[PDB]
Enzyme design. Structure first.
Site, PDB file in Angstrom:
ATOM      1  N   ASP B  25       7.531  11.434  -9.648  1.00  0.00           N
ATOM      2  CA  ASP B  25       7.426  10.449  -8.568  1.00  0.00           C
ATOM      3  C   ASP B  25       6.128   9.637  -8.629  1.00  0.00           C
ATOM      4  O   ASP B  25       5.090  10.059  -8.119  1.00  0.00           O
ATOM      5  CB  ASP B  25       7.535  11.144  -7.207  1.00  0.00           C
ATOM      6  CG  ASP B  25       7.737  10.159  -6.072  1.00  0.00           C
ATOM      7  OD1 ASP B  25       7.896  10.585  -4.899  1.00  0.00           O
ATOM      8  OD2 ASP B  25       7.719   8.935  -6.367  1.00  0.00           O
ATOM      9  N   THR B  26       6.204   8.457  -9.244  1.00  0.00           N
ATOM     10  CA  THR B  26       5.070   7.517  -9.297  1.00  0.00           C
ATOM     11  C   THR B  26       4.589   7.021  -7.936  1.00  0.00           C
ATOM     12  O   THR B  26       3.452   6.517  -7.799  1.00  0.00           O
ATOM     13  CB  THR B  26       5.418   6.293 -10.165  1.00  0.00           C
ATOM     14  OG1 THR B  26       6.526   5.567  -9.604  1.00  0.00           O
ATOM     15  CG2 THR B  26       5.738   6.732 -11.577  1.00  0.00           C
ATOM     16  N   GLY B  27       5.447   7.167  -6.931  1.00  0.00           N
ATOM     17  CA  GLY B  27       5.127   6.828  -5.553  1.00  0.00           C
ATOM     18  C   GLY B  27       4.318   7.858  -4.777  1.00  0.00           C
ATOM     19  O   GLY B  27       3.846   7.553  -3.678  1.00  0.00           O
TER      20      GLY B  27
HETATM   21  C1  LIG Z   1       6.862   6.564   0.619  1.00  0.00           C
HETATM   22  C2  LIG Z   1       5.928   6.810  -0.563  1.00  0.00           C
HETATM   23  C3  LIG Z   1       4.744   5.862  -0.395  1.00  0.00           C
HETATM   24  C4  LIG Z   1       5.412   8.246  -0.712  1.00  0.00           C
HETATM   25  N1  LIG Z   1       6.518   9.222  -0.772  1.00  0.00           N
HETATM   26  C5  LIG Z   1       7.026   9.407  -2.146  1.00  0.00           C
HETATM   27  C6  LIG Z   1       8.373   8.702  -2.222  1.00  0.00           C
HETATM   28  O1  LIG Z   1       8.749   8.527  -3.595  1.00  0.00           O
HETATM   29  C7  LIG Z   1       9.459   9.464  -1.473  1.00  0.00           C
HETATM   30  C8  LIG Z   1       9.886  10.795  -2.091  1.00  0.00           C
HETATM   31  C9  LIG Z   1      11.013  11.418  -1.296  1.00  0.00           C
HETATM   32  C10 LIG Z   1      12.346  11.226  -1.669  1.00  0.00           C
HETATM   33  C11 LIG Z   1      13.376  11.781  -0.910  1.00  0.00           C
HETATM   34  C12 LIG Z   1      13.084  12.550   0.207  1.00  0.00           C
HETATM   35  C13 LIG Z   1      11.755  12.739   0.580  1.00  0.00           C
HETATM   36  C14 LIG Z   1      10.728  12.184  -0.175  1.00  0.00           C
HETATM   37  N2  LIG Z   1      10.622   8.602  -1.443  1.00  0.00           N
HETATM   38  C15 LIG Z   1      11.159   8.106  -0.330  1.00  0.00           C
HETATM   39  O2  LIG Z   1      10.708   8.171   0.811  1.00  0.00           O
HETATM   40  O3  LIG Z   1      12.410   7.468  -0.633  1.00  0.00           O
HETATM   41  C16 LIG Z   1      13.147   6.918   0.450  1.00  0.00           C
HETATM   42  C17 LIG Z   1      12.709   5.479   0.625  1.00  0.00           C
HETATM   43  C18 LIG Z   1      13.721   4.666  -0.172  1.00  0.00           C
HETATM   44  O4  LIG Z   1      14.617   5.606  -0.774  1.00  0.00           O
HETATM   45  C19 LIG Z   1      14.581   6.827  -0.039  1.00  0.00           C
HETATM   46  S1  LIG Z   1       6.250  10.603   0.033  1.00  0.00           S
HETATM   47  O5  LIG Z   1       7.324  11.516  -0.220  1.00  0.00           O
HETATM   48  O6  LIG Z   1       6.269  10.274   1.444  1.00  0.00           O
HETATM   49  C20 LIG Z   1       4.849  11.313  -0.340  1.00  0.00           C
HETATM   50  C21 LIG Z   1       3.692  11.134   0.400  1.00  0.00           C
HETATM   51  C22 LIG Z   1       2.492  11.756   0.037  1.00  0.00           C
HETATM   52  C23 LIG Z   1       2.433  12.570  -1.087  1.00  0.00           C
HETATM   53  N3  LIG Z   1       1.283  13.179  -1.456  1.00  0.00           N
HETATM   54  C24 LIG Z   1       3.586  12.772  -1.840  1.00  0.00           C
HETATM   55  C25 LIG Z   1       4.770  12.158  -1.451  1.00  0.00           C
END
Ligand SMILES: CC(C)CN(C[C@@H](O)[C@H](Cc1ccccc1)NC(=O)O[C@H]1CCOC1)S(=O)(=O)c1ccc(N)cc1
Lengths: 99, 99
Positions: B25-27
Site C-alpha cells: 500500500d503506497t498510500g
Molecule cells: C486513505 C489513505 C491516505 C491511507 N490509508 C491507506 C489506504 O490505501 C486505504 C487502505 C485500506 C483499504 C481497505 C480498507 C481499509 C484500509 N485505502 C482506502 O481507504 O481505500 C478506500 C478509499 C477508496 O477505495 C477504498 S489508511 O488505511 O487509512 C492508512 C492510514 C495510516 C497508516 N499508517 C496506514 C494506512
C-alpha cells in the site's frame, strides 16, 4: 516515471481545468477527491476505509490527467483525508508495483 | 516481480510464523496489521483515514518477511479490516511505482 517510496507518492493531477495534488494509493480500490465541484450527473454512494464508512458523490467517466497520463473514469468526492488516486485509475495509466 | 493493479495487490507476509495476506500500500505511511498478540514493548497511537481514526499499538524493530524479502521495522497493530504494508517497509524491499 519510476517513483520510490521514501516520500509519499504525491503527483499533480488536472481535473476540470484545475491543478490538484493527489496521492498514488495502491491500497485504494477507488479514486476519492476532497470536496470540490464537478460538472454533470452524480449519484450518492458510500465507501469504507480504515476508520469506517463515508458518504461520497460518484461522478462517472471523468477525465483526469495524472502526472502527464490521461485517465477517464469514476471519481468519488467526499471527506477523504487527502486526494487519493485509486486502482481504477492507476490501472488506466499503466501503473504497476515493482520490486 | 511486477504486480499489476487490476486487483488488490495482496501478497503473503510472515510475522512470527503467522502467515497473513497483506496489501502493498503506497498510500500508507506505516504498516498496520490486524489484531494479533505480539510480544514486546509498544506505544499507543491513533491513525486516520477514510471514516476517521483507529487506535493501534506501535511495535518497533519487528522482523517481517514480505513476499520472500526480509524487512524489519515499525508495525502498527489494531482493528484494521485489512493487513497493510506501508511505505516504511515497502522501501526496505525495494518496491517502486512505475508507469
Ligand atoms: C486513505 C489513505 C491516505 C491511507 N490509508 C491507506 C489506504 O490505501 C486505504 C487502505 C485500506 C483499504 C481497505 C480498507 C481499509 C484500509 N485505502 C482506502 O481507504 O481505500 C478506500 C478509499 C477508496 O477505495 C477504498 S489508511 O488505511 O487509512 C492508512 C492510514 C495510516 C497508516 N499508517 C496506514 C494506512
Amino acid at each position: 516515471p519510476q517513483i520510490t517510496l521514501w516520500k509519499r507518492p504525491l503527483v499533480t493531477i488536472r481535473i476540470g481545468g484545475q491543478l490538484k495534488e493527489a496521492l498514488l494509493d495502491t491500497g485504494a480500490d477507488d479514486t476519492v477527491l476532497e470536496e470540490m465541484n464537478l460538472p454533470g450527473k452524480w449519484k450518492p454512494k458510500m465507501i469504507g476505509g480504515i476508520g469506517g464508512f463515508i458518504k461520497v458523490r460518484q461522478y462517472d467517466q471523468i477525465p483526469i490527467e495524472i502526472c502527464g497520463h490521461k485517465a477517464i473514469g469514476t471519481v468519488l468526492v467526499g471527506p477523504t483525508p487527502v486526494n487519493i488516486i485509486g486502482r481504477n485509475l492507476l490501472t488506466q495509466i499503466g501503473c504497476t508495483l515493482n520490486f
